[PDB]
Symmetry: D2
């Protein structure tokens, strides 16, 4: 369990990955 940084270039593509990470984070917030 470690923390990694994902620096991507652009703006819209970064939002796509942000959505996939938004649901995963929701898993940790499944209370």
């Amino acid at each position: 369990g470690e923390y990694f940084t994902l620096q991507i270039r652009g703006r819209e593509r970064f939002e796509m990955f942000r959505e996939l990470n938004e649901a995963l984070e929701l898993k940790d917030a499944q209370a």
Copy 2:
């Protein structure tokens, strides 16, 4: 709100997308 099919070639890559869809689906199952 419609249903779309994503047919990908390979096997491991398909699992990656499956994980991103596993959390999104978890959002719908946030009960």
Copy 3:
């Protein structure tokens, strides 16, 4: 190497995964 189907519900989210698959497919088209 097999073919799998990824049926997702919604419309915008499907586009996100479509982009990640658009680049991967571009890898196979790296000629």
Copy 4:
């Protein structure tokens, strides 16, 4: 066109996003 950082927790999940970003980056390297 800007640069954003995606800090995710874990280790395997970060690899998944790294793959989707590996192909996108390959698009910029389509020479």
